[PDB]
Design a binder for this molecule. Structure first.
Ligand code: NA
Ligand code: NA
Ligand code: NA
Lengths: 118, 116
């Protein structure tokens, strides 16, 4: 059985897994433009999280823990709200992957799509 | 899993170990805009074999959280097509281990500057 929102929400934010039972908004907040918000997901992905039909083709771009700390620029920022570990980086698509073109289409479908929402 | 084997993975799915270290998997640490800056000499040489690796990895995002928390972009350039990401993970300052967590993270951030 799928974990309830009550149970899944007990994980620290960065270790949460969105599903139909605990969706992207519930886990990670509303998509939005601010520096603190995520901007990724169309309505279907938002509602289904890792249950989304094309989730594996998105997750193939998410970094391992080793790669996350190995590839990114990591910083620390202390503010009246708290202490933050900051990260930035870039992941290259493999243009020799037979599914390259579909990967671009899939990613374009989800980037900043919240701007079109009712 | 040798260097030859582990290197077959896409960069973002690599696992650094003593046999395939952070430099070999992810490049030299450095200051440039998409070079990694994280790791003292011990971490660089051992990767996920570092004995305090669990206290670092507790801050690494799941795939769901990576795509849920971050600001994601795409850039096309002479080098290819890139997925860009930025974000921030809040430490829990009510955790009694908070101060040790800050110390452990600062031990590795930009530490490359102090060695060749
Ligand atoms: Na679906
Ligand atoms: Na295809
Ligand atoms: Na780079």
């Amino acid at each position: 059985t799928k974990k309830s929102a009550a149970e899944a929400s007990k994980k620290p934010r960065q270790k949460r897994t969105a599903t139909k039972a605990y969706n992207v908004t519930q886990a990670f907040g509303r998509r939005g433009p601010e520096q603190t918000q995520g901007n990724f997901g169309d309505q279907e992905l938002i509602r289904q999280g890792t249950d989304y039909k094309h989730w594996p083709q998105i997750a193939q771009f998410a970094p391992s823990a080793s790669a996350f700390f190995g590839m990114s620029r990591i910083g620390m920022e202390v503010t009246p709200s708290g202490t933050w570990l900051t990260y930035t980086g870039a992941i290259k698509l493999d243009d020799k992957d037979p599914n390259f073109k579909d990967q671009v289409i899939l990613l374009n479908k989800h980037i900043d799509a919240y701007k079109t929402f009712p």
